[PDB]
Symmetry: C3
Subunit: 333 residues, 3 copies
Amino acid sequence: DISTLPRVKVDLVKPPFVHAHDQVAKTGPRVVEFTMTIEEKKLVIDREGTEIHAMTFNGSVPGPLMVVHENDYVELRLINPDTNTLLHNIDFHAATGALGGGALTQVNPGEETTLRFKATKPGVFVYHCAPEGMVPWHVTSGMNGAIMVLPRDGLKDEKGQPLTYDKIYYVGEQDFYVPKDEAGNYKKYETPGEAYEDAVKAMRTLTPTHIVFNGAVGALTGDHALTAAVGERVLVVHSQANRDTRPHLIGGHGDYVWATGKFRNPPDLDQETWLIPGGTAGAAFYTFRQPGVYAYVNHNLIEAFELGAAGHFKVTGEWNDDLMTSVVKPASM
Amino acid sequence: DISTLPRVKVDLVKPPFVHAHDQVAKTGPRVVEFTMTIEEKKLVIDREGTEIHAMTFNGSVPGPLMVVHENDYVELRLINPDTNTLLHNIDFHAATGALGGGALTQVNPGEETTLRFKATKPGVFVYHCAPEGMVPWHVTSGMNGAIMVLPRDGLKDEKGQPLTYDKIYYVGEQDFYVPKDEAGNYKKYETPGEAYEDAVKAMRTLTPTHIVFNGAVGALTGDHALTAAVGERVLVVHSQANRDTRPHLIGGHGDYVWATGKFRNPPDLDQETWLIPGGTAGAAFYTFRQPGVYAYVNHNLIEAFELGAAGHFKVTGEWNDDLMTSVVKPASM
Amino acid sequence: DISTLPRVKVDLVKPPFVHAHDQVAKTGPRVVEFTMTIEEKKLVIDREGTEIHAMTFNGSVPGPLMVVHENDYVELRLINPDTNTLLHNIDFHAATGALGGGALTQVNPGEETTLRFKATKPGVFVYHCAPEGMVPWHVTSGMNGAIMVLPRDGLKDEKGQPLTYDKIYYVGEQDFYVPKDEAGNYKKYETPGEAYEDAVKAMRTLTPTHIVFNGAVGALTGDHALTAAVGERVLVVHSQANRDTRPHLIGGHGDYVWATGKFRNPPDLDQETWLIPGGTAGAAFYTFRQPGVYAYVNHNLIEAFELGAAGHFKVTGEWNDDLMTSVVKPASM
Ligand SMILES: [Cu+2]
Ligand SMILES: [Cu+2]
Ligand SMILES: [Cu+2]
Ligand SMILES: [Cu+2]
Ligand SMILES: [Cu+2]
Ligand SMILES: [Cu+2]
């Protein structure tokens, strides 16, 4: 009887940050209540001022990461304000039935709905918008996120022993297909509907114009770099709703990687690079052993450094000359 | 001595269906005899009437699924009728030696050959045509299929316990590269030879014009949807002879997945999406828990919903409100 | 104290060959000293005479394979002769800290540097050039290789038992983006700097013009085929620094495959094809059971047979009619 389970409301936070949660469940199964508000908005995605009509869950690209435990119930209130112009819905890869929920959550502008599903499988999963006839357009306009379903006793290593993270970050990787004029300049549009016909032609080339973390070129660099300290254990959740990616931490590794994101499987160890298929979320665990700046990239290095799929870690602490040292600094022969 | 083994002739069925077989072998190793007839034919691949010169095993795209048990012998009689115009052969990824058999099975129109090989490794494997100098052209014209080599004691889960399927379906995913005129219209040709020079240029862009299940856009929708019932255990074999794919069951999961298709390895559990590399066949096992329509897609959603890589399951049974329910139906705020 | 460890200098050999080494370590941890010299050079990559400005470690594409054991120290002396025109560095995916070493190894023409790092994780790993602002350009100009860090007790199978190879080969797969004129002809340039602006536009299409093994179309065919004998156990190390690949041995298998190249994980068994993500090195182990010619390809067959990603094995020995035989040779019906 769901009527007799405890309920908790959770307010979501903007990526790359993640709302507070317990790794090991302290209570029994609960109904976890979330609310998301759909927002269609103009987004500037590169340093040149390229502007797109993004379609977002809660105003961010990606949508926020939701965290629950196995066999909790997720209750999502989904609001489509009448200032929006399009029909939207939501499809949880974590859920069983009704096209992930998409058949039960179609909301026109000015409508809302509340969906509930049981989180029967532990792992990280994608959620995305999926309205009939327009699925790729909404997803590649930024309307995707992820949900993490933790095992009730937390994460384990390949030998069944507990793994505990100190920090968790969520990196949503987005491929964008911005229509171009005949000379190669990106087009601007007044409304989302105006862009549709050009957007379809652009999608059909299968060649993204931009591939970004957290909605924009450089969004996770500079003052917005991810931070950690030597000795800290960091979980990085990475999702790609449409296109394969291959994350790599430059100067580090994935000590424990669930590349396809499902926690009943044992992790891969010591990865340099791992493949997250389009339509999947993965998770990688690393313990920092050296301070300094790290780059986190899609290791198709064109996609990373030309199209935008690169971010930074800033890590503090003491340098370890046992692991690495410059014996002879660069000098003339 | 092969002369003293039992022999059985098997007649193949058209995909997505699979010829009758036993999951657990009831006899010892046998010589399993198959016959396939090559057919070059015109095929209409989309709703707009786009027509291509397909090259097929047994008149279908994909070719039929063959099922044998580990350490059986496969004896294939391959017929190239004199109404065809091209040299063909066959390369089994399941076989050891002579380029998978391709060196021993070259048949001009009006020729036939009989090849035998021992199926020493359990798994699902691709077979495809591979004539020297023209391999990609024949494969991307539809001349590929798959063969399943079952362990003699059947499928097992990650703990070594028996897994038994109630239904099996074979989904062959095909990338097509239809030449286009300067305005973007697809070209028609009178014979396969006429298309060759344009087809090579089209293949070299590495961008498919169509990606389809079972030979055509919508081939597995409508009246041709795959069917199942709540509680039934379904094995879906998926092959892609040329290009990576990432299957996903919308509203479901891969409970047990051999993404690279080889049964001596333990399955991945609880997959939302899995990557089948080009040149590989994979298999996914799912038990349906909710009725209704499911979509089965390549989760590059452009490839699925714009280029054709989507099919349907129709599943009967009782809806389970514990797993999913609409608490508040879509309504005005 | 590094001052008290033994030291050995190792001279590198040109791929596909690999410098001599022990599979099982006979000594304790050592400082292994390597020297590499950067060479910018013109390279002819296809039969049509297409010429590119390659950027190489030690004059080859790929750079040479380095072999050490877990917890050895690698000491690399890196020389950038004043006949070169560009800044270069090196990033080891095997190393921890300072962007894989790239932050500590920037050398202008006429400069050298010596870097040391501890090889704490067993596996095959990519190394590549990575100068700030120009990373994809240097990598896709051929400036990448691999390093193998063997477990001190050698390779093991999925049950922990020793696997020993008789021969080892290194296949470096390179995607090239040669700029083209309006008619589709490849452009020539006098210096690397002259090509930069065109090369960036070419890279941004994400469509390689050539994909080759060992620096050129056909580099591993003919007299340069890899060789083996029936009964020999062969380790093939395969790297791709920028783009996914899916190797396949035509007529054979990967008996034991570490697709993401990391030896603390158990191998995948009986693979027909496996995916090596861009930015990764993998390793496959096979025992030849049939003589003859084998093709080793990227099983995107367009990339293999149209763009260049195919090589040959020549294998000697006795044919085994139990595994495969032509029952009826190709003949008229
Ligand atoms: Cu939407
Ligand atoms: Cu989806
Ligand atoms: Cu053929
Ligand atoms: Cu093949
Ligand atoms: Cu360089
Ligand atoms: Cu790298």
